[PDB]
Amino acid sequence: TVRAVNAWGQQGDPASVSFRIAAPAAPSRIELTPGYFQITATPHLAVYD
Amino acid sequence: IRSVNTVGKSAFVEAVGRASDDAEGYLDFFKGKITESHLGKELLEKVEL
Amino acid sequence: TVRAVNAWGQQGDPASVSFRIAAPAAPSRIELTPGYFQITATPHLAVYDPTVQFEFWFSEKQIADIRQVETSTRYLGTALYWIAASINIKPGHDYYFYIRSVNTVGKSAFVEAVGRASDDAEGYLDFFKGKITESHLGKELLEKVEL
Amino acid sequence: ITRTITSANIDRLRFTFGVQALVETTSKGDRNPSEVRLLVQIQRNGGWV
Pick left, alpha or beta for residue B5 (phi over 0 → left; psi -120 to 50 → alpha; otherwise beta).
beta
DSSP letter (8 states) at residue B24 = H
- B14 within 8 A of C103, measured Cβ to Cβ: no
Cα distance from B13 to chain C (closest Cα, Å)?
Answer: 22
Is A42 near chain B, with CB under 8 Å?
no
* C-alpha span between C138 and C121 (Å, rounded): 21
C-alpha distances (whole Å) from C115 to each of B12, B18, C42, C52 are: 38, 28, 12, 23
* C-alpha span between D32 and C79 (Å, rounded): 27
Chain A partners of B26 at a C-beta cutoff of 8 Å? 36
C-alpha distances (whole Å) from C51 to each of A30, B49, C48, C133, D26 are: 29, 68, 9, 54, 17
Nearest residue of chain D to residue C45 (CA atoms): D29
Containing C44, the helix (H) or strand (E) segment is strand C38-44
Is B17 near chain C, with CB under 8 Å?
no
3-state secondary structure (DSSP) of residue A16:
coil
DSSP letter (8 states) at residue C30 = E
Cα distance from C118 to chain A (closest Cα, Å)?
Answer: 15
Quoted resolution (Å): 3.4
Method: cryo-EM
Alpha helices in C1-147 (DSSP H): 69-72, 121-125, 139-146
Of C64, C67, C65, C88, the closest CA to residue C76 belongs to C88
Under 8 Å CB-to-CB from D9, ≥6 apart: which residues? none
Alpha helices in D1-49 (DSSP H): none
* C-alpha span between C139 and B26 (Å, rounded): 19
Under 8 Å CB-to-CB from C133, ≥6 apart: which residues? B40, B42, B43
* C-alpha span between C119 and C37 (Å, rounded): 9
| CA end-to-end span of chain B | 58
Is B33 near chain A, with CB under 8 Å?
no
C-alpha distances (whole Å) from B39 to each of A16, C57, C136, C141 are: 82, 42, 10, 13
